[PDB]
Structure 1
Amino acid sequence: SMNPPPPETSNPNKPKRQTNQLQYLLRVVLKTLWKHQFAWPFQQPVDAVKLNLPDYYKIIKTPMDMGTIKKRLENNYYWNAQECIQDFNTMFTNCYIYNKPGDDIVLMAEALEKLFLQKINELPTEE
């Protein structure tokens, strides 16, 4: 009946960097997934109130979405590429945990995840 606050995208006391891998995660990985025809459900936090899914944030205790990831990358919120990759994987996994296997939303996440894996396969060596 209420949404939780979204994940943070700024934290001044959290150490952060820009690395060439993090730049790749923004310029190649996020950009590729964001433009995809099936990106739209993943471009912002789940609005469980509008969807009338009061159980969503009972099941999903570590929400993540590409809106959040985009803002984190734009703010250079991360220390390393692994932290950002973890956020994408959390997003996909949440979708697979909550939804019925085979449902259209799962097919959408799978399409995005296939591209994600293809891009991080070519993550550049650091520096």
Structure 2
Amino acid sequence: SMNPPPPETSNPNKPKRQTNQLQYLLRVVLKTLWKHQFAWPFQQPVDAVKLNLPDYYKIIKTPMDMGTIKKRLENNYYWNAQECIQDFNTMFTNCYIYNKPGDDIVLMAEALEKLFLQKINELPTE
């Protein structure tokens, strides 16, 4: 079996910014989710080979994970906060699409998403 290449985290011809909203997304939002007891499945791309999930990347065509988001934030990959918020939402959605209601992983994603929503509710004005 084979994993796909990970999402890109570097692209020199993509225009970039470091806005106060993006700073908040790193220092408050990512940091909060990263340290959570349920973060670990989301801290790197889904390894479909070692999890024995040969259908994962058949079903999930827009992979995203917090390891990727962390790298994107640390390397100032984004132009705006909405791009990054979309990445978090892609990560959660992927989990709900692939897995079954009530599965441990879904409970984990739901706990992280609750915190995510609480933090982005107070996203600072630009």
TM-score (norm 2): 0.99
CA deviation vs aligned residue, 1:19-44 (integer Å, no higher than 9, x gap): 00000000000000000000000000
Give the Cα separation in 2 of the matches to 1:119 and 1:30.
10
Deviations 1:45-71 (A, max 9, x none): 000000110000000000000000000
CA deviations 1:51-97 (Å, max 9, x no partner) are 11000000000000000000000000000000000000000000000
**For structure 1, which runs of at least 5 residues remain unmatched after alignment?**
none
In the aligned structure 2, how far is the partner of 1:15 from the partner of 1:58? 31
Could you tell me how far apart the structure 2 residues matched to 1:108 and 1:60 are?
18
In the aligned structure 2, how far is the partner of 1:56 from the partner of 1:101?
17
* SS of alignment partner, residue 37 of structure 1: coil
2 CA distance for matches of 1:50 and 1:37?
21
Distance 1:44 1:12 in 2: 22
Runs of 4+ in 1 over 2 A off after TM superposition: none
Alpha-carbon offset, residue 108 of structure 1: 0.0
Aligned residue in 2 for 1:25: 25
Partner SS, residue 100 of structure 1: coil
Identity of aligned residues (%): 100
CA RMSD of aligned residues (A): 0.4
Whole-angstrom CA distance in 1 between matches of 2:58 and 2:39? 24
Residue number in structure 1 paired with 2:96: 96
Residue number in structure 2 paired with 1:60: 60
Taking the aligned partners of 1:53 and 1:121, their CA distance within structure 2 comes to 35
